[PDB]
């Protein structure tokens, strides 16, 4: 359902530094969350589980690329640090919360690099 549009376009010139931040739905239990780069396959960047903690996708030092933070009304922020953006970092980024009782909630960012 997300491969129709849904997401937000994000333009950048090479060299740019950009933070993407995603936010949990109110009044849900946070079950797990993750960041992915979406091509033909969904390639996970980092995953956070509220008990097991951080887990990275393939060789990463991803603890320097993501951060989770709680705020006021149980809402959680989930952010991805993009640094020194090349055309290779361009593409579709997907933040996927799995919540209870509402299930999956996803936010798509299209990073466009000139």
């Amino acid at each position: 359902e997300e491969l129709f549009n849904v997401g937000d376009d994000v333009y950048a010139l090479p060299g740019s530094d950009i933070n993407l931040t995603c936010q949990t739905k109110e009044k849900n239990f946070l079950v797990q969350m993750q960041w992915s780069k979406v091509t033909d396959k969904n390639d996970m960047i980092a995953l956070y589980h509220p008990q097991y903690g951080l887990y990275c996708g393939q060789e990463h030092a991803c603890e320097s690329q993501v951060a989770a933070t709680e705020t006021e009304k149980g809402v959680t922020n989930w952010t991805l640090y993009l640094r020194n953006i090349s055309s290779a970092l361009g593409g579709k980024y997907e933040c996927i919360f799995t919540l209870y009782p509402e299930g999956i909630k996803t936010t798509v960012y299209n990073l466009i690099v000139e």
Partner: antibody, heavy 116, light 107 residues
Framework: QVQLKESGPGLVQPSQTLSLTCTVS????????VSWIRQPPGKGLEWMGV???????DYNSAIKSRLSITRDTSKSQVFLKMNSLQTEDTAMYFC??????????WGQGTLVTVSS | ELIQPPSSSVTLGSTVSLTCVGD??????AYWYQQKPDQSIVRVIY???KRPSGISDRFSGSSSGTTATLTIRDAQAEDEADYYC???????????FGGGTKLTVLG
């Protein structure tokens, strides 16, 4: 770069309690776990216990009765406290973290000698 | 619980496979650690067969049923170490280490 550094007294007397501290840098302690692993001299690694990303804990059932793990998120430190020590507790003590259960980062370890 | 042979040999340039056998390994991933004499610990294989950045491509891994194996190719002297496998046990999914295999490189 992340670094885990264990610190401790080096020498503790039998029937005293052993207080170790793991200082985490480059990892957000509130988003990560920290395990304590021990290695008696010449022996293999034995997992001792974990404080989960949410402040809960679990321990190896063979030492659970004397073991206690806590944390101070603001100081970014995790504490191991183990009471009523015998000579067999003489070991190298490591903390490790992230990619549970396949801990990706390890401290160097501190040696603890239990002796009168 | 996690069964590893306490020692093994290879001669320079040849291949060893080190094994780790456990009941739940068909349902749990295995991780492999190399511990050098100064006692520092390095993760060389994760999730049965994935290799982390910065580890020599002579290291690889594979799993079938209840034995996970770690495979060192073109053995170098600096592969002399203790290798430990790590996995998860019981309903509470807690970690366990095998007993460790001491690997000596001959020649």
């Amino acid at each position: 770069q992340v670094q885990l550094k264990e610190s401790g007294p080096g020498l503790v007397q039998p029937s005293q309690t052993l207080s170790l501290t793991c200082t985490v840098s480059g990892l957000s302690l509130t988003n990560n776990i920290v395990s304590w692993i021990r290695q008696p001299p010449g022996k293999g690694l034995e997992w001792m216990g974990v404080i989960w990303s949410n402040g809960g804990t679990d321990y190896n059932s063979a030492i659970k009765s004397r073991l206690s793990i806590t944390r101070d998120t603001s100081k970014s430190q995790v504490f191991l406290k183990m009471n009523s020590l015998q000579t067999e507790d003489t070991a190298m003590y490591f903390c490790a973290s992230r990619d549970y259960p396949g801990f990706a980062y390890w401290g160097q370890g501190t040696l603890v000698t239990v002796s009168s | 619980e996690l069964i590893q042979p306490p020692s093994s040999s290879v001669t320079l340039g040849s291949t060893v496979s080190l094994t780790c056998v456990g009941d739940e390994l068909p349902k749990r991933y295995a991780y492999w650690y190399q511990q050098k004499p100064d006692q520092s610990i390095v993760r060389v294989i994760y999730e049965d067969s994935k290799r982390p950045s910065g580890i020599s491509d002579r290291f690889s891994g594979s799993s079938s049923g209840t034995t996970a194996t770690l495979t060192i190719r073109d053995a170098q002297a600096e592969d002399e170490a203790d290798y430990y496998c790590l996995s998860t046990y019981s309903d509470d999914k807690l970690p366990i280490f095998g007993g460790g295999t001491k690997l000596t490189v001959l020649g």
